Design a protein around this ligand. Structure first.
Ligand SMILES: *[C@@H]1O[C@H](CO)[C@@H](O[C@@H]2O[C@H](CO)[C@@H](O)[C@H](O)[C@H]2NC(C)=O)[C@H](O)[C@H]1NC(C)=O
Ligand SMILES: *[C@@H]1O[C@H](CO)[C@@H](O[C@@H]2O[C@H](CO)[C@@H](O)[C@H](O)[C@H]2NC(C)=O)[C@H](O)[C@H]1NC(C)=O
Ligand SMILES: *[C@@H]1O[C@H](CO)[C@@H](O[C@@H]2O[C@H](CO)[C@@H](O)[C@H](O)[C@H]2NC(C)=O)[C@H](O)[C@H]1NC(C)=O
Ligand SMILES: *[C@@H]1O[C@H](CO)[C@@H](O)[C@H](O)[C@H]1NC(C)=O
Ligand SMILES: *[C@@H]1O[C@H](CO)[C@@H](O)[C@H](O)[C@H]1NC(C)=O
Ligand SMILES: *[C@@H]1O[C@H](CO)[C@@H](O)[C@H](O)[C@H]1NC(C)=O
Lengths: 495, 75, 75, 495, 495, 75
């Protein structure tokens, strides 16, 4: 029941022939899955780890210059020579300085000058890369068991947390009393870890695009070096000054930590401090419910009196949760729970805690339901002393549809193709939509790479206006649709 | 500088909030507004140039927007 | 960030070379060229959009130049 | 003779009624002035000093956060409050977190959260300002005495240094033997220091626009704060991260010294250590030659044999400088020196060291002359023992014409209106030009402030094309002229 | 007497008011000057020496690679690193070699490889440059004294060697018995020694163009270098081999001496061993024949018999040289020598050894004369024992006129505009022609620089065709003339 | 190689004989002749291309000669 209380909560209904459903487990969100005669389980992706990282490249963000030397030559007499030019730890620059009788030279003209200083790095910005085989996804499955402290508990003792690794596709967890849950996760397709870098500047880390990392304009090392002194782009962090064309100077040009922080805007921070723990991304899994069992199945109904120990509370998603206690005998029984209309004639609500049971007498049981919109009745217990509680759900079915459509659009905006099999039970339509999305998303990503959201909005508006003023409606509809999609993406992008 | 090449638009965004997302989502727009405020002279010239070049109101407005956006950033 | 306000066109520039004259002279052009190499897709889109919006070939080239410049500039 | 060897050396010829001429002195440049009956003087502006600077703002380039605290409220209980929120040294941020039974709340919703962290600055940059009357300009005046050690010599002991301040803008230099030279300078019309800031960061200092300094996005103190416990824009140097709705914390951004160095491109670097020494900008003075007289003009032709101790050496400006030592009787004598043709039937070039004389028979005297563009012969001495030196000048008259045209255009680009006072003699054409260029430069600065050089090129190209394609020739000519001027300015900017 | 027997010999006749004549002296050519009432002299610029050269650069023509090393990384893990790459003494290149499980690596793909090897130069070519003021031309002045074994004699002791330096524009020689001869040569215009390099390779040296020398694609050194191990663009003398993309090797190309000899085709060789003395070029001089008198004009005529000791021989230029022996008394007398016709009615010849005399009785005197075209008779001595020697010149005045026109055209092709300065008396026609030639030659040198003679012929032919097929009768004439001149230059070039 | 950039058309020539004047006078002509003999196939294609491209006979011959000369030259 670790999902109750999370804004990014998704409910997955039903299972495919063969009793399996494939879901996408994003970080910071949990997926609650329920199926006929199957326990309701909550799956959350809580950790991602990359192991055995390799150093792609080191950048220099803080430097220091020393051993500055300068040499000059008379006009027309070639170039000056410094013995330091031979060493690659010296940043050297050639310029022209006025020479003449005043400077101790016989001629009158621009004479060459060379200034060399030793480039020493003070603060590194390492960049690491990990193979996709070294990922270790951690997932936690929490059955809606109705335990008193499980309603939102994010600590242990409530769920079974497993590790998804590319070595083994089949991951099973035996939930105590609920059977065995089998998951077929595809950790390789989750995040392109061979197209990304684990940047680590001082005590912070970022997951940055690999090419973007390689294109940084700073002094760097190949990452294979063991000496650490042959920086390549030393002149990106050093200034040579020739103010009045009479002498040359060199300065080390400050620290690039703040500029790097500004340049890392748009990247997601990660915890590379110990282990490279990533707390972002998704993981598509195929849940197999074949081996699942209802916890309370083969229990007698509770015929005693129930009491409310925590009043009904409404969740962000419209599903109520109530805590009740049992007073009667036959303690290992299952709760009679229903959501009836005001006339108590039809069962309107849908129970999310699919099979509420009373394991212990002196132990409150949490039940989550989905009351219908408007006036309803939460009836708990049997007729002699049943608790018939009135609840009102503010909202509308049209509002639910619009909110669900917006949630699905937001999901497709975050995952693209991978969002087409979030709750897909195979299906011809799902496969066709996924293929169409793959093609169109490839085109769109190619056309909108490295462009900010403001430019996305501008281009969407321009395409929309072109489509609105087109002659042929076949082209106009397509252009306006593309423009509206682009405007929506620019509005939702950069989160 | 590295600051001139942020990580926006790389396509790695997930549900998780990015670094300095809120702290830097409107920074560029605010910067363009501040630049146009401090430099009203060039904005008028850009408007006149865009009007002269653009045959239609769409082309003129688009050119004016592009000039006004590029000038501060290219600065 | 401070790096986005270069202090270039403020005037008060004399015969003495300014701070980072040689580098800042072409740093923006280098950055735009690198962006255009790394994002060839958006350049084609900008070319097509300019071709559509502008009637006169000068208008099209002007819009293409402005749009390409402003694309990385925002980012 | 200090102006010999400087590539920016420039020549002033002629005087006005009252034997005065306006000259603009720049730090890099040296000015040599010639008059019909006056000695040739070299003018250089060697030092600008600002005294008693007063801080305008202190900016934080590096900070550190400590004493982090957090407070959270329930989903519908309103925004939380912290004691530190009142505190001006604490930086706070309000956000919302997912709340429910699991958090210990009792109600499911987006409860508020506020986190505050103490801001303490580590590195700052002091934006000092100076009143205009506290500027002091030091000018060194050295006559073309012909002293051997005087060519391109800047060590000292050769000329006279006159200090000019706005309060005392008229000053007199006594050039022993050459009379007295009076300078009626105009410091107040040079750099406008009421609109300029002396920006010092660590051990490097720059001269910056004051509005630019005030618009910088960094936390700042009022400037008179000895406590440094009220920073005004702490939001810019800290970032509050709420990756998933559950937690909020704050981290300070990195040292902004490197970001500032990039932000300072296009700002001239000054020295602010042990005096706010500026080696940038110009000064316009009025030279009064009334009391300036030639030295040794009451002498007699040497009538002795000369020897060349330093060979002819053409300078960057088409003039030749030679050093001759005298060997004959009548020591304090005028040196015969002509630049004639092969047959000695014409005088082809003049001499810049007007009235070269021999003060001491054992002291070499070095003369500077400007020979013609063809073959010319530098004749020194009288018939018995005369020495004729052949020379050949590479240039051409048209080349010199357009070189001087380019030099004048560049001078106009840098000084603007003041360029019309460089060799002005109080004429009416000069005044009309200066008024016209004042109006046009005011308009141009209004319409082109803060624009990059690439943008200047693009705008010039657009304007020139509009002119090239226009029905009205008058407007066509005006626009094409403006476009060509703008393109030239864009090409020559960023000096 | 030293000018007789040289294929390149010019006869400069007559002087102007003031008794000076302009002559251009060449190393391989020679000049004989004649004037009324003045001795005939022979001039030969026998040596040019450049002193105090300063090396401008030092190219490498043979290297050797040692201490080769190589390193590589797995694919996708950046570039490899070598400590040797820290030192610029090592030539290093980066390339990718396919890697995989067999290469000790984990994954398959193109893996970077770096190869380094120490670059040592064993043989280098040094290019020195000289100051025009450090040139010293040697000129030998030899009168037609008609002494024994003086005809075409190069040993010496017959004339006086005057050294011409730029320090003095007046060179003075005291020919015993003839007075003093004044020379006013102009070394500065002779040859631009600040636009050409004195390249010496091994035991041979060439006078090359400066920019051409700086453009050589060989590993070079600044010339100010003292260590001599930091070569630049070493890659032009080493190749890196990656045949199948499995390993990378670096080898040294080989000795570049033969390729350098092939590149030097068109350069003029000089002696840079034991003195930078180069026997090529020309020296314009203005000889002044005032203070120059005939020798032995006070001697009486020889009243004796002359016996021929060396039969008449005709020089390549039609000037017959005859050696005679005197046998009578009054030994120091004048030889009666004339060239008459058969009847001795009127003199036809033009004695070139003016005022032949017999100083010592036992010394044969070899007089040179210029007979007329056809029959003429050389009359030597008084009626008793007089010699009447016949001669036949075998030519035409038209033939000699065509020959002299061809010689003048060739001089214009070789000396450029300095041709107009040969045998000149300061006429207005010559000066206007020289100015026109300077303009046209400037344009032609701009248009035809760096093109082989075959390209010259092709361009001349094309321009001739264009001109001769043009509508305008003026443009046609001008173009055909230009084409014919270009064809002539191409035919007469590469000498 | 360094031999591909000869010291030919620099303009320092004098009356004195240059380094390898006689040998190098006809080297390129003879090398072109040898190349034409060895690769006659390209010569016919060059002739056809010259005939097709050039309208005037003078243009045809000029293009043919230029192609024949350049072919070895780029080799
Ligand atoms: C989450 O579950 C844990 C149990 O693992 C709760 O901690 C228990 O709290 C009860 C009541 O004080 C104690 O009797 C148990 O000894 C505790 N067990 C452990 C392992 O700590 C915890 O309170 C729950 N969280 C919430 C918010 O209810
Ligand atoms: C600039 O002038 C100073 C004199 O004021 C020169 O210093 C002297 O130079 C002479 C010349 O050799 C020496 O004999 C003296 O010992 C130097 N010192 C003094 C106090 O006279 C200085 O050399 C000049 N600059 C140059 C480049 O020559
Ligand atoms: C060139 O002149 C030199 C010098 O006048 C000639 O050398 C002389 O040769 C004779 C014959 O053996 C000797 O008796 C003299 O002693 C030599 N003089 C000197 C100074 O060495 C030389 O023979 C002449 N050569 C020609 C071809 O005429
Ligand atoms: C740098 O300077 C230090 C002291 O000034 C000296 O010991 C060291 O050898 C120098 N190194 C180089 C490479 O110049
Ligand atoms: C900040 O924390 C330190 C840590 O000991 C404490 O001494 C100080 O009182 C705190 N200041 C505050 C909370 O304002
Ligand atoms: C190069 O190799 C030789 C042969 O072993 C060795 O003596 C020498 O020290 C080496 N030098 C370098 C710089 O590697």
């Amino acid at each position: 029941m670790r999902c109750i209380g999370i804004s990014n909560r998704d409910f997955v209904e039903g299972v495919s022939g063969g009793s399996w459903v494939d879901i996408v487990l994003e970080h910071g969100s949990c997926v609650t899955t329920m199926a006929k005669n199957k326990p309701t389980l909550d799956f959350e992706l809580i950790k991602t780890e990359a192991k055995h990282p390799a150093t792609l490249r080191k950048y220099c963000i803080e430097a220091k210059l020393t051993n500055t030397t300068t040499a000059s030559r008379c006009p027309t007499q070639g170039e000056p020579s410094l013995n330091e030019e031979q060493d690659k730890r010296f940043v050297c620059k050639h310029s022209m300085v006025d020479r003449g009788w005043g400077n101790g030279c016989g001629l009158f003209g621009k004479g060459g000058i060379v200034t060399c200083a030793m480039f020493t790095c003070k603060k590194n910005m390492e960049g690491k890369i990990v193979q996709p085989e070294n990922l270790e996804y951690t997932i936690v499955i929490t059955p809606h068991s109705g335990e008193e402290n499980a309603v939102g508990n994010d600590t242990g003792k409530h769920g079974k947390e497993i590790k998804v690794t590319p070595q083994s596709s089949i991951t099973e967890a035996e939930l105590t009393g609920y059977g065995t849950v089998t998951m077929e996760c595809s950790p390789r397709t989750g995040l392109d870890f061979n197209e990304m870098v684990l940047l680590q500047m001082e005590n912070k880390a970022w997951l940055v695009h690999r090419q973007w990392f390689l294109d940084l304009p700073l002094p760097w090392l190949p990452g294979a070096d063991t000496q650490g002194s042959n920086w390549i782009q030393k002149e990106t962090l050093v200034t040579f000054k020739n103010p009045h064309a009479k002498k040359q100077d060199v300065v080390v040009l400050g620290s690039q930590e703040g500029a790097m922080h500004t340049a890392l805007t748009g990247a997601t921070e990660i915890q590379m401090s110990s282990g490279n723990l990533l707390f972002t991304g998704h993981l598509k899994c195929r849940l197999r419910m074949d081996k699942l069992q209802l916890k309370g199945m083969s229990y007698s109904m509770c015929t005693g009196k129930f009491k409310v120990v925590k009043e009904i509370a409404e969740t962000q998603h419209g599903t109520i949760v109530i805590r009740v206690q049992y007073e009667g005998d036959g303690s290992p029984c299952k709760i009679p729970f229903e959501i009836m209309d005001l006339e108590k004639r039809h069962v309107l609500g849908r129970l999310i805690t699919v099979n509420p049971i009373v394991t212990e007498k002196d132990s409150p049981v949490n039940i989550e339901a989905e009351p219908p919109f408007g006036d309803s009745y939460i009836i708990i217990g049997v007729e002699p002393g049943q608790l018939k509680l009135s609840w009102f759900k503010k909202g509308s079915s049209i509002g639910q549809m619009f909110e669900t459509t917006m949630r699905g659009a937001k999901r497709m905006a975050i995952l693209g193709d991978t969002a087409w099999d979030f709750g897909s039970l195979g299906g011809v339509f799902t496969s066709i939509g996924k293929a169409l999305h793959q093609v169109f998303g490839a085109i769109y990503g190619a056309a909108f790479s490295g462009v900010s959201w403001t430019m996305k909005i501008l281009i969407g508006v321009v395409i929309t206006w072109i489509g609105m003023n087109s002659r042929s409606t076949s082209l106009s509809v397509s252009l306006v649709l593309v423009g509206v999609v682009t405007l929506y993406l620019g509005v939702m992008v950069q989160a | 500088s590295v600051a001139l090449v942020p990580h926006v638009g790389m396509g790695l965004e997930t549900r998780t909030e990015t670094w300095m997302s809120s702290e830097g989502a409107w920074k560029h727009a605010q910067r363009i507004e501040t630049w146009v405020l401090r430099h009203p002279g060039f904005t008028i010239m850009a408007a006149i140039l865009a009007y002269t070049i653009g045959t239609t109101y769409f082309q003129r407005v688009l050119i004016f927007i592009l000039l006004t956006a590029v000038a501060p950033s290219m600065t």
